[PDB]
Amino acid sequence: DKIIHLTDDSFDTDVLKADGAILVDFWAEWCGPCKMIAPILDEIADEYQGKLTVAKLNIDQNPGTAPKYGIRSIPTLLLFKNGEVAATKVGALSKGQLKEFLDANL
């Protein structure tokens, strides 16, 4: 709904050239912890509307981007501000913890 669906080719304009904070979830359908956090991202997107944009990159349909960031495992969340990584988080976490993680960087 409010989650931007990324591609290797949309990444630059959607993430690097965007205004304000962007959380990007690197994920894949066969990744258990990834599916575990998928619904929390939908809720975060609605809730932080105006302060943050939430976005997903499926690494199977889009194999280009992950390596540019030295991503080793999934899920990995990168928080972008003004085209640079501000913070990252590897592996699953709760909704509550994700709010803590974002408040720490916004």
Structure notes:
- By secondary structure, the chain is of the alpha/beta class.
- Helices cover 29% and strands 27% of the residues.
- The PDB classes it as electron transport.
- The entry lists the keywords Alpha Beta, Electron transport.
- It forms a monomeric assembly.
Which helices and strands appear, and what pairs or packs with what?
Blueprint: E1 4-5, H1 11-16, E2 21-27, H2 32-47, E3 52-58, E4 76-81, E5 84-90, H3 95-103
Parallel strand pairs: 1-3, 2-3
Antiparallel strand pairs: 2-4, 4-5
Radius of gyration from CA coordinates: 12 Å
Q: Write down the CATH class.
A: Alpha Beta
Estimated share of beta-strand residues: 25-35%
Largest sheet: 5 strands, mixed
Helix content: 25-40%
Q: Provide the domain count.
A: 1
PDB class: electron transport
Keywords: Alpha Beta, Electron transport
Assembly: monomeric
Entry title: Crystal Structure of Thioredoxin Mutant G74S
